[PDB]
Amino acid sequence: TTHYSVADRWGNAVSVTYTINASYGSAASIDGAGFLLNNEMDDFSIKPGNPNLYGLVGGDANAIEANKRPLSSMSPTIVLKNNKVFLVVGSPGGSRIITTVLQVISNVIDYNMNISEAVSAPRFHMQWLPDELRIEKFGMPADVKDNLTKMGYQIVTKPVMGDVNAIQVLPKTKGSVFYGSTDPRK
Amino acid sequence: TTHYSVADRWGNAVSVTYTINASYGSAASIDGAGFLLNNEMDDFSIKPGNPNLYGLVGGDANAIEANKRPLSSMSPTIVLKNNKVFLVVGSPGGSRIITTVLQVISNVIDYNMNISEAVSAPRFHMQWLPDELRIEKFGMPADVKDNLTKMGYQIVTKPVMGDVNAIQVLPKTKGSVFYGSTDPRK
Amino acid sequence: IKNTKVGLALSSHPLASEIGQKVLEEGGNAIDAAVAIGFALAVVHPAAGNIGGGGFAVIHLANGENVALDFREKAPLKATKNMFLDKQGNVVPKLSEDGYLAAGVPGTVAGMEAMLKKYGTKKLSQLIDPAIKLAENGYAISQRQAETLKEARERFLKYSSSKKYFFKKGHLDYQEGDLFVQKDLAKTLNQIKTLGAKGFYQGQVAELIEKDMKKNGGIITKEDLASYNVKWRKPVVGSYRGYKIISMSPPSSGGTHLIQILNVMENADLSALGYGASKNIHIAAEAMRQAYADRSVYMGDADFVSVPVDKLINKAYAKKIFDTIQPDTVTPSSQIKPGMGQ
Amino acid sequence: IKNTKVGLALSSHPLASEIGQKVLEEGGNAIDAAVAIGFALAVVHPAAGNIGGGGFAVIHLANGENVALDFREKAPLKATKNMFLDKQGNVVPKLSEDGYLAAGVPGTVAGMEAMLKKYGTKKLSQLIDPAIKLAENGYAISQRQAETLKEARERFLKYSSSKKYFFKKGHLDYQEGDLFVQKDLAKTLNQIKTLGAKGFYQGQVAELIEKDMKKNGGIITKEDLASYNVKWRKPVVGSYRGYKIISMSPPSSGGTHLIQILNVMENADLSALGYGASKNIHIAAEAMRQAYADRSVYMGDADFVSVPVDKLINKAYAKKIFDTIQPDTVTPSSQIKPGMGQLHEGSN
Numbered sequence A, B: 001t002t003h004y005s006v007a008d009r010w011g012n013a014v015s016v017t018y019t020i021n022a023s024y025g026s027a028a029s030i031d032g033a034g035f036l037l038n039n040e041m042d043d044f045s046i047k048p049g050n051p052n053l054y055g056l057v058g059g060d061a062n063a064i065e066a067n068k069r070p071l072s073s074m075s076p077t078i079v080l081k082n083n084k085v086f087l088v089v090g091s092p093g094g095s096r097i098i099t100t101v102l103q104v105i106s107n108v109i110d111y112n113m114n115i116s117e118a119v120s121a122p123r124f125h126m127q128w129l130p131d132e133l134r135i136e137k138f139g140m141p142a143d144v145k146d147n148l149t150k151m152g153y154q155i156v157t158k159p160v161m162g163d164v165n166a167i168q169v170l171p172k173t174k175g176s177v178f179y180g181s182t183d184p185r186k
Numbered sequence C: 001i002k003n004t005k006v007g008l009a010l011s012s013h014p015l016a017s018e019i020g021q022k023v024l025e026e027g028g029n030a031i032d033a034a035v036a037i038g039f040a041l042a043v044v045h046p047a048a049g050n051i052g053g054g055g056f057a058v059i060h061l062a063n064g065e066n067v068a069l070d071f072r073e074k075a076p077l078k079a080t081k082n083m084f085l086d087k088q089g090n091v092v093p094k095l096s097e098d099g100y101l102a103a104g105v106p107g108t109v110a111g112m113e114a115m116l117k118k119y120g121t122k123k124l125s126q127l128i129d130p131a132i133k134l135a136e137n138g139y140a141i142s143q144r145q146a147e148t149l150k151e152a153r154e155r156f157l158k159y160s161s162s163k164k165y166f167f168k169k170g171h172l173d174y175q176e177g178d179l180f181v182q183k184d185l186a187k188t189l190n191q192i193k194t195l196g197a198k199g200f201y202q203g204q205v206a207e208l209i210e211k212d213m214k215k216n217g218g219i220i221t222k223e224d225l226a227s228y229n230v231k232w233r234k235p236v237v238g239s240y241r242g243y244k245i246i247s248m249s250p251p252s253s254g255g256t257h258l259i260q261i262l263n264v265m266e267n268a269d270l271s272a273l274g275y276g277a278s279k280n281i282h283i284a285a286e287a288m289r290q291a292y293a294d295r296s297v298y299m300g301d302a303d304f305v306s307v308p309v310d311k312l313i314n315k316a317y318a319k320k321i322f323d324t325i326q327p328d329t330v331t332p333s334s335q336i337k338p339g340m341g342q
Numbered sequence D: 001i002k003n004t005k006v007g008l009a010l011s012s013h014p015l016a017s018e019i020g021q022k023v024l025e026e027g028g029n030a031i032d033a034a035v036a037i038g039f040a041l042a043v044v045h046p047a048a049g050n051i052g053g054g055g056f057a058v059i060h061l062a063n064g065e066n067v068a069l070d071f072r073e074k075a076p077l078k079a080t081k082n083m084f085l086d087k088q089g090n091v092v093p094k095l096s097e098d099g100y101l102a103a104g105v106p107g108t109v110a111g112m113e114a115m116l117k118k119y120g121t122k123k124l125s126q127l128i129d130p131a132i133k134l135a136e137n138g139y140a141i142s143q144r145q146a147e148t149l150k151e152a153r154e155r156f157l158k159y160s161s162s163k164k165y166f167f168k169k170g171h172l173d174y175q176e177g178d179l180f181v182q183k184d185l186a187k188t189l190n191q192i193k194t195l196g197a198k199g200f201y202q203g204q205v206a207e208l209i210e211k212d213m214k215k216n217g218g219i220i221t222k223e224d225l226a227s228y229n230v231k232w233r234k235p236v237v238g239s240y241r242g243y244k245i246i247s248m249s250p251p252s253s254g255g256t257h258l259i260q261i262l263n264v265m266e267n268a269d270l271s272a273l274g275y276g277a278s279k280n281i282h283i284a285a286e287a288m289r290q291a292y293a294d295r296s297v298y299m300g301d302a303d304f305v306s307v308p309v310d311k312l313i314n315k316a317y318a319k320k321i322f323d324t325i326q327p328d329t330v331t332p333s334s335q336i337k338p339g340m341g342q343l344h345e346g347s348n
């Protein structure tokens, strides 16, 4: 999965997340055509309660049916301020997309980080099952981990989450200024 | 102040910190010559107990004498591992140079950060007078601040400290790889 | 990264970002640039960028309209509920993950053409040229690409088609710095250049897809391809502390839960304690926990199932979640009730 | 940033870094590159890079030797203890900070030449060419430079020389993206190109310095410039968890306190709790507190006063400091004793 963000001088913004699901999709290509096929069918629930590639589970709502579109977690997002473009943001990461994107938005709005700071900041993740608080290397100091563990979290350090490409737009006396960040994770 | 670091293929390393003291030094230039004069005389103790530009104090040892060199905090440093160049590191920052440089070294050695991580990591600072623990914006979370405050630190958030240019040298199959980092604070 | 004249086009590959940025410099709009990037990434970032997959675009137009494009893959016409299970009702290992049966009907090419035709200003023929040049002439394998290719090796090895495209002669891994040329991909992109989306969903390319599927135990047919349809949908919309949030609606769960989680968080003054405070992490994590429990029961393609989006993004529901959050203890996942009673 | 061929030359300005890197590409050694960078930064980073200041170089040689070069400024020949005080013994505001009396005798040009002649391989005339080109033909003011220039405005405006050099016509602030050209600086660097350090410390440039000093109430003369001397010194050396630390000795306090504070920290297993743990911050911070108290009493130019470097960097002293650090609590600074009773030379 990969996300890209575009904003122009006329006030259009386009936030695109697209994918073949796994890295290199199904790993099978169309002979003669040179492209990899997706493995997007794994985003369905293939059996009630069966965890997919991202540990996500389902029942009736996300069961397979002919022509049905498998449930995604992709979250291409635009944030507006007074109806003008403010953020263009998104990320890959399967189940982690939702939490990655909201953390970047929160970092800007709640903590007044610029877009580079908001993207670089360590990320955590909770997805109900598994019942764990997923964190990143160097992302949480002992004091914070200790306090969260006391609350009843099971903290686990896992590979870095996401790959945010984000734009922040700020008005100027004349026009706007566009600020960008790619993700130090990849 | 500014620091630069050099490492070559023969195994030499050069770590240079140099300065005109304050930003633009004394602000006075030599007419006809095009260069700014330092204000390095402020690095002496000009009166016992008088705090200088970085809040540093002195008495007899660092009093002004003709031809004497004013005390510096500049810390251009080289670290060796098994007799081979490992780190070339240094920074500007007046009184904060010492603490900036040691934190980068500790980050690599104690915490196994790569040179980029080690340089980007938030820095703290204690210089005895003022009696305060100086930190950076977004550098320390509430839980850590609360515990340090309960120990007796007066925590103050101040502008970012330092501008580290550092090299890490690692053995590979044959010879060395040189990894560099400039400082995000620049 | 800063721009004060034409804006920014940002992706995970510098060659694709450069292509998008150039479209902006040459007077194209954000949609024009996005289309050029979508095709460029199909060449230079094959782990993820694609013409064989699908996705979503959320678009804010100059005139103030906000729209969403669904170019998500569809289950093929022959797909069935239990298609990945054996006779005894148990999952067939890797059947949904590796190989031709794991594929939905691709939507990317349809999506790129749809947004260009509705909102773009440049011709597809011109926007796709940079991608074709990269496929025909090649580009350098990056350090990370060499790693991800190496990791995919044993998967590629299962399929004669992928062994041909993603290895060097003798099925050898590409290495960092190698020039990667994709002649058949260029043929496919050239069909799209000349014929538009019909160059993928019909004609020679559709024939190649159908016949390779049949040979290899897949089920996508020309009928699937000819019937592939994008959908222009309303985005899901929320607010957070005076900002408007525009995100992807079903068949993504992403925008709904993003808005739901932020709605819960809105009840706390997070700014008070600042970034990385355990008390703030706790509120967010408990909101996440409920949202993902909700996802597992309520979420799917709304064209087929009832999805309570409006209920999930209702601030009153979020307040109810917030009020269950204990100062310094969690609600174990085993004790979460989807919808809480909704 | 990565290199597997000629190494790296890294500075705070990309134009200076590129100049250093090209020296490495062209076959020069780390000293050659460092000299090129020092002159380049004097053009492209005038807030900090300089020919009017001084500094230090710590050098590790291929053969295993470690050396330090002191090119720190000297107090002028006519400097005095109370030179910045009025008749009542009070500090004259800004006298040590703004203007011509605030200056020590510059060491940079002497330092550059000294390390080049002893350990370099290339000629100064060639290594200074890139800096001359940037002075003569100009370079683009960066965003940060525009900010720092603006902050210094009121200071520059006090001096006719700086008004000429660091403002555009009409004494306007330089803006981001403006091309900044330094003709007189170019002339100075050309004298150094032609004559070496003597092109700065003697002749026409020395005359310019003496004249402007006299005009403006400074005390540096041709004599001070002719007396300027670099000093080759032993670096301070220590160890931290098996790694060798090589850093700057007096007249810097930096290397000594760096080794001292790391020595204290070595007594704790910091890796156990990892980056940013309060327990780890406490040990380092309490070590810092004692080190800076020590600095205030025991540190100065060791050529002129007694400085107990060996005692300050001794692990046994650091172990004593470590022992005084009580778990979960600070020692207030008002209770800290410089030296901890360990640095008394009898009743001295």
Ligand SMILES: N[C@@H](CCC(=O)O)C(=O)O
Residues within 6 Å of the ligand: A001, A019, A020, A021, A022, A040, A043, A071, A072, A073, A074, A091, A092, A093, A094, A095, A097
């Ligand atoms: N196929 C997943 C994305 C997988 C990923 O981002 O790695 C989805 O649509 O939610």
Ligand SMILES: N[C@@H](CCC(=O)O)C(=O)O
Residues within 6 Å of the ligand: B001, B019, B020, B021, B022, B040, B043, B071, B072, B073, B074, B091, B092, B093, B094, B095, B097
């Ligand atoms: N003049 C100070 C350095 C000033 C700074 O780094 O800003 C010193 O030599 O320690």
